[PDB]
């Protein structure tokens, strides 16, 4: 399959190599076995699928706006990182000039491209995703978020916050396990061996609590917010004894405490969405 | 019927009665006791033997599983049975402190009982299900000799030889759970909010999130040797990048009215690491800034 990569930076060059490794006829172009052309006009003309990874959405428009007429009948997969509004604006512009627009985000570094274990998230034209999915598989596992092009930007930000939340609880537990004391002086590798098994149950919690959020009904069942707050105060006590100062226990008891004061102690953790949202 | 291994459960609260049922369902000759009568339920009809005294329950099995309200109650029940427990295996799944676990273990060693201190990483309805964890620490002889029976409750993991480890592990794993779930709630509120690419349901985001947690699990496994080595190479995701992308999350959350305190925590923690000159280092370098 013919595919054009616009932008051969660290990530861009990784994407072009993934297409070549997967047996695609690849044309490349950079602002600074692949067939490199000297102009973006030539690159766009060489393929019906044009993948874009530029530094900013401003760079995307500076390169693509002069090519407004050349893009009719083509598919534009824009993996550039940017805001939800810029993804929507580029989607509308592409729709104006007759191009199928898929906005995407790469959920790994340049060295993760080509490996099918890393995710790339796309949102926008469904005909583009379905028609291009086999080619996009060269870069990693493709997921279709839906029809709104701006979804990929929001998802990346929301998934990074989930990652940092996980990693901050992990680092807190690592220091907790490493501190001197009875049952302490455990290495981070030993703790993480158990932690990664435990993450299967944490994933079950998230799967259990998402319908709670959507329904506005948060049955506490066997793990009420009373018990969360109860055990969070033990974590804060243990952390103060073992010298672990991460700010997490203060965030958690204050959040649950506000929900308890509101009278929702008999609810599940998902009720706490009402206390971080507007 | 019930010709499997003989096991006693002390304590018939919701969790203890769940443990007894799981032993029965696996076919074990199960003797049960509770500090107050009438809390056996359908256990005796399911094949268990309820006895009136803890001394009688202890003498009925070479494996004694303990699940009471507190370690105070543990000590009150076990203290009079010092000689009765000599030569037996005591598996104490009561929730408590590392010191109480250690006090109980040292008492057990004093009187000739093999002691495993454990924690159950689920609720009573999770006992006997799939992939739910029970963590044990203490006597390796007890773990290896009792493992086949303990599998009736859930997936057992041997944490090591220090009996107090299980208590510390439970507290550390809960913090990891709350950190994950608070970042999840943050993403839920971020995704559901108005705006381009928004108004996404929590269920839709979570299906994507549960795929993403495989990569997040790789980050933890990658960073754990960093902490143990004291060497935090940033590679292609440095603390500089973390901090810069955290500011986008902070501004995006501010726009969409998501107020979790997570973004301020992350930028503050990474900010001190960069000010100290470790911006090129990995996320694992931050362990020195909470230690
Ligand atoms: Cl670039
Ligand atoms: Cl009790």
Author numbering:
A (entry chain D): 3 to 34, 45 to 290
B (entry chain A): -1 to 289
Question: What does the report in the manuscript say about this coordinate set?
Answer:
RedE resembles the canonical IRED fold with an N-terminal NADPH-binding Rossmann domain and a C-terminal helical bundle mediating homodimerization. Here, we present crystal structures of RedE, including apo, NADP+-bound and two ternary complexes with AFA and NADP(H).
RedE shows no conformational changes upon cofactor or ligand binding, aside from the reorganization of the loop after β2 upon NADP+ binding positioning R33 to interact with the adenine ring and 2ʹ-phosphate of the cofactor. The C-terminal domain (residues 193–288) is a five-membered helical bundle where the latter four α-helices (α9-12) wrap around the interdomain helix of its dimer partner (αʹ8) forming an extensive 4020 Å2 interface (27% of total monomer surface area) between both N- and C-terminal domains as calculated by PISA software.
